[PDB]
């Protein structure tokens, strides 16, 4: 489809790899008794492998010539969830962390010896500050417009 | 110095107790006792969280675990 790739629900190397893995597991399964705990563990492993392959096929990925899925970070609308959808999420969480830390530092800048508050964290003020990062984009944008983000 | 020596002895005893309990609970000692030549000792079992279950190799005697 894109860059000479094959849809993952149509390629044959995917099925061949699945068969190889299943046979490799079943070779070890035969050794033990069918009712024994290792048999149950190996059956669970086989079920997990089958579910993973089915999910990968149903999710609309694209295997390559050799048989493995390929990620597309290009920006096509059919792969929103491949890179772009997770990435934004990360930024959100990441921003949270940063924002919170910055706030805490300012919250201890007033006192005469902030080093004691840096090496021994206090829990009440930190817990007050932690949940303010849930709306970090709005506060950050307002501070940028006001001009309090950058020192002078 | 005396107090530090006592603490070190306590840590060593805890380590020995842990080794013995692992031998008692997650091990194949009884299988190895009958046929020692064809069975590999093993006293650690890995969980099945991510795909690390492949670390539970077949040492022998109807057991899977890391060979010690």
């Amino acid at each position: 489809d894109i860059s000479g790739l094959t849809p993952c629900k149509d390629s044959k190397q995917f099925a061949k790899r699945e068969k190889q893995q299943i046979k490799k597991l079943e070779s070890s399964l035969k050794l033990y008794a069918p009712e024994s705990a290792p048999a149950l563990a190996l059956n669970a492993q086989i079920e997990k492998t089958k579910r993973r392959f089915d999910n990968y096929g149903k999710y609309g990925l694209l295997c390559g010539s050799d048989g493995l899925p390929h990620l597309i970070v290009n920006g096509d609308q059919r792969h929103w969830g491949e890179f772009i959808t997770p990435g934004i999420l990360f930024l959100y969480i990441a921003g949270w962390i940063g924002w919170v830390g910055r706030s805490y530092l300012i919250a201890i800048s007033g006192e005469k010896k902030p080093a004691m508050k840096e090496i021994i964290i206090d829990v009440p003020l930190a817990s007050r500050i932690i949940f303010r990062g849930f709306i970090w984009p709005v506060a950050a944008y307002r501070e940028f417009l006001n001009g309090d983000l950058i020192a002078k | 110095v005396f107090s530090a020596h006592f603490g070190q002895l306590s840590i060593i005893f805890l380590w020995l107790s842990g080794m013995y309990f692992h031998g008692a609970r997650f091990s194949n000692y009884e299988a190895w006792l009958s046929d020692p030549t064809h069975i590999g000792p093993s006293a650690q079992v890995v969980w099945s969280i991510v795909g690390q279950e492949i670390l539970n190799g077949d040492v022998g005697g109807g057991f899977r675990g890391i060979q010690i």
């Binding site: 705990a37 563990a41 | 609970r25 997650f26 009884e30 079992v45 099945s48 057991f63 675990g65």
Partner: peptide, 11 residues
Amino acid sequence: SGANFARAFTV
């Protein structure tokens, strides 16, 4: 020996 292995996979 089976029970010892099963103790890890109880859940």
